[PDB]
Structure formats: structure tokens, C-alpha cells
């Protein structure tokens, strides 16, 4: 149907916007601490601590499968990256501190993304 095509066009446009957002967020992680899943080889007990691991590569895979239906779903995954890190690592670590900085600098990007998704009507 034409309605289904229209819905699919909206999803494609949301995906385009979210791709730009993801690139901007990842730029705020220059050390690439959050680029890939936490290695169970360097951190073998990780899954005993963290029940829903997340990272930028995993988000990008979901994104390109058009697996984010709205901005909220995308933000949920971004918040997992930060929140997982601030639980597993102590405040005096380069990991925790990278998550704080990513959260802070990311908030700015996400604030304007919410305005764009709303005003253009992408969900």
C-alpha cells in the first residue's frame, strides 16, 4: 500500500538523522572506549555485573537494519553505554570519567536531535 511506503520513507529518514547523531556522539569518544563490546577476554566477569551490554558498534548494526523506530529507543541504548560503565568502573578511572564526558557532551547533541525529530515529524 501507499501508506506502508510512506511509513517506510519516514523510517528511512529517521535512520538518516540517527546516523548523523550516532557519528556526532561517537566523536565525543575520541579514545574509542565505547566503540566495541566490552571484551569478555579482558573482563571475564563482565556479564555477572552488566545484564544489558551496549556499545557504538552494536548500535550501528541495529541502526543500519532500521531497528530504531523512534529516538527514545536510540537514546535507551546510548544511556546503556554510559550507565553500564558508571556501575562497573569506579569514579577514579579513565573509563568512568570518559562516560561522564560522553554523557555531558552528548546531551547537547541529543537535545537538538529531539527538536529535529519532532519538528520534521519522523516518528
Kindly report the number of other CB atoms within 10 A of residue 88's CB atom. Answer: 17
Q: Between 70 and 105, whose beta carbon lies closer to ligand 8TG?
A: 105
What is the 3-state composition of the chain as percent helix, strand, coil, each rounded to the nearest 5? 70, 0, 30
CB 31 within 8 A of CB 56: no
In degrees and rounded to multiples of 5, residue 114 shows phi and psi of: -60, -40
Q: Is 42 in the site for ligand 8TG (CB under 6 A)?
A: yes
Q: How far is the CB of 104 from ligand 8TG (least distance, A)?
A: 17
Given 24, 58, 70, 89, the residue binding ligand 8TG (CB under 6 A)? 89
Q: Is 101 in the site for ligand 8TG (CB under 6 A)?
A: no
Q: Pick the piece of the chain touching ligand 8TG (CB under 6 A) from 59-67, 87-95, 104-112, 113-121.
A: 87-95
Report in angstroms the alpha-carbon separations of 17 from 2, 34, 58, 77.
23, 21, 17, 16
Q: How far is the CB of 43 from ligand 8TG (least distance, A)?
A: 5
Q: Is 59 in the site for ligand 8TG (CB under 6 A)?
A: no
CB 46 within 8 A of CB 88: yes
Q: Is 88 in the site for ligand 8TG (CB under 6 A)?
A: yes
**Given the rule CB under 6 A, which residues bind ligand 8TG?**
33, 38-39, 42-43, 85, 88-89, 95
Amino acid at each position: 500500500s501507499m501508506e506502508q511506503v510512506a511509513m517506510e520513507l519516514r523510517l528511512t529518514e529517521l535512520t538518516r538523522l540517527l546516523r548523523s547523531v550516532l557519528d556526532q556522539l561517537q566523536d565525543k569518544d575520541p579514545a574509542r572506549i565505547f566503540a566495541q563490546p566490552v571484551s569478555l577476554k579482558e573482563v571475564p566477569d563482565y556479564l555477572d555485573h552488566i545484564k544489558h551490554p551496549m556499545d557504538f558498534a552494536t548500535m550501528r548494526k541495529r541502526l543500519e537494519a532500521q531497528g530504531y523506530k523512534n529516538l527514545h529507543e536510540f537514546e535507551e541504548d546510548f544511556d546503556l553505554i554510559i550507565d553500564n560503565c558508571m556501575k562497573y568502573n569506579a569514579r577514579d578511572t579513565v573509563f568512568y570519567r570518559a562516560a561522564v564526558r560522553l554523557r555531558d557532551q552528548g546531551g547537547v547533541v541529543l537535545r537538538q536531535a529531539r527538536r529535529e525529530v519532532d519538528s520534521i515529524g519522523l516518528e
